[PDB]
Amino acid sequence: VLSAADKTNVKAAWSKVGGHAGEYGAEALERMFLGFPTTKTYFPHFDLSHGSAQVKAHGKKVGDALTLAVGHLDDLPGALSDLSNLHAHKLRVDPVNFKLLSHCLLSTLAVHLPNDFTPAVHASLDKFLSSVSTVLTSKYR
Amino acid sequence: VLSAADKTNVKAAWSKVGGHAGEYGAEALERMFLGFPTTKTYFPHFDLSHGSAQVKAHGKKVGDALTLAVGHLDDLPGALSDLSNLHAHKLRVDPVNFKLLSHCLLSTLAVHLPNDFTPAVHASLDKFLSSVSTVLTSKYR
Amino acid sequence: VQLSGEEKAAVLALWDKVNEEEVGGEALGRLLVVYPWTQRFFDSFGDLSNPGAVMGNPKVKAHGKKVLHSFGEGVHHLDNLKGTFAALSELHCDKLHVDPENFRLLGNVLVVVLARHFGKDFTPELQASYQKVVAGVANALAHKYH
Amino acid sequence: VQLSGEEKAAVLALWDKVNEEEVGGEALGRLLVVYPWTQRFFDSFGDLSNPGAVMGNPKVKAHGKKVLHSFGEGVHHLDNLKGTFAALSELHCDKLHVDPENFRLLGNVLVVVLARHFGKDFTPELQASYQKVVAGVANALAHKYH
Ligand code: HEM
Ligand code: HEM
Ligand code: HEM
């Protein structure tokens, strides 16, 4: 998919994320809900303002799916196919929201890994997240 | 790349375009220059206002490249690779401009093939043009 | 929007020929078929599972007609778009939370449908003026987001 | 932009800690590396062929500082962004013809750079206020296009 150099950078960067993938996934969602209020409509108000358990669970799943993707960069459509059916076919998530989440994920990585989030790594992660987004929005039917 | 159904629709629709591909390519460029003035910066003023030969030549090349793409839907990156080097690496064409041209191309098809430009065909052509655009913006280095 | 006196007259002359029901139904139908995530907002219309179902759906036609009528109000109030669309901006942004990118998408679909219906009379120059009109409407509808 | 009194104070307090040269150079550098088509506008800066060349380039740092200084003017004039950026809108739209999408891209890069420098102090809530600020600036710069 990506270039060999990007693949190398992404695998490397994700090794530094390690066990924090789910925590970063949850924080990225929070950043997204507050920064981009239109994204809140897919979720119960209670889960966004009076709780955190369901957001954290979606956060862990986001983190796990990205970890899976990093291990299958040569075949993203095959590793993430099922998630497109859910997000596009069933829930009809507007594609713009994957761009918003991607920005919030990069923001979250910059906060926690300031020394590892170099310009070259930033560029490769951006391309990775755009490829994941492309797969997630591939099947609206 | 696209789904089997889209591939079928695109090959069919392009057979109705036939020998008019270059003429449609030139008209789509004109529509784009007038509708979206920022796109004019990549070209000599003279070619946009006091002539038409160079626009028509770019138009024919656009049409020929789309015809080539339709015959290689399974491997677009391989058929259009060289054009990405030119448009992205050498000329640094802003990616937004491929979206603008795509819209103007759909507009041009609707003008000339009103009875063949059905909703299903519109949807498949949109996906095709988006895939071509993705390839053309694949190598900024 | 930034329209010359000549462009404005051309824009209004074409609108006299626009059948809001026919064009409206077709524009909304195409939005639903070409950009299927938009279907999330129109569950009440019924079966939207395939192109034939969408284009023939009487609720799609009736709502498309209302959408086009509202575009017509904009075309006749080019100097006060924000004010003309204030209440609609409230509805779309505060109640429905429609992402503004979809306003642009609908505007572009409308232009493609005008092209389909008017053919060669929908010249590159007239399309240019219409692109300024639809951008203007999209921006006015997105006003309550900013 | 739509900012509460509490948000505004939080936004201004963070800006007191912003080194416009350091943050500015880094924001422009990242734009050039992550979105390389933007390099088309900065030929005079010299070698931009790889990340190390870009981030260390003294012209990138000097121009980034000017860009950030101008963001600072916006942060201190949140109630009159259009007026604050009128002349810059003329330059970017009428002279350079920069596509407005790139204004948003730069705004988002700036937010990522603030996050990198401030770490946990750049909370989800403070990022939210900054997103409204950068959207506001992007829109004001795009004003002469509409
Ligand atoms: C990298 C991007 C994303 C990934 C990998 C991802 C992953 C997932 C996963 C793994 C699930 C749970 C599937 C299951 O076990 O039932 C899920 C559910 C869901 N996702 Fe996402 N998601 C992403 C982005 C988004 C976005 C941007 C939104 C909307 C703004 C969204 C909205 C939802 C919703 C509404 C559910 C259903 C929750 C439930 O039923 O409890 N997702 N996602
Ligand atoms: C489907 C999309 C497009 C295709 C297939 C396409 C195709 C081509 C081809 C085949 C060439 C000539 C290569 C050669 O023989 O030297 C060319 C040149 C060029 N294209 Fe495109 N093009 C597309 C879109 C665009 C866009 C959107 C722009 C800018 C708005 C653009 C700007 C240029 C420029 C500036 C040249 C150089 C012209 C010259 O040196 O005479 N192209 N394109
Ligand atoms: C940008 C051009 C648009 C215009 C001019 C427009 C105009 C209108 C008008 C006139 C109404 C009727 C208001 C009422 O119920 O009193 C309406 C309602 C509505 N609009 Fe739009 N609209 C636009 C785009 C969109 C898009 C992009 C979406 C979402 C994909 C959308 C979703 C809706 C929905 C769900 C309703 C309520 C109708 C119902 O409850 O069935 N609109 N709009």
Ligand code: HEM
């Ligand atoms: C959206 C935030 C932006 C702000 C606040 C900003 C601000 C500025 C400022 C303060 C100047 C100096 C004006 C002068 O020369 O007197 C300038 C010039 C310039 N800007 Fe921007 N800018 C922004 C985005 C962009 C982007 C996205 C591009 C293109 C990718 C761009 C390209 C340029 C260029 C080429 C110059 C002239 C400098 C030279 O000749 O080397 N700007 N801008």
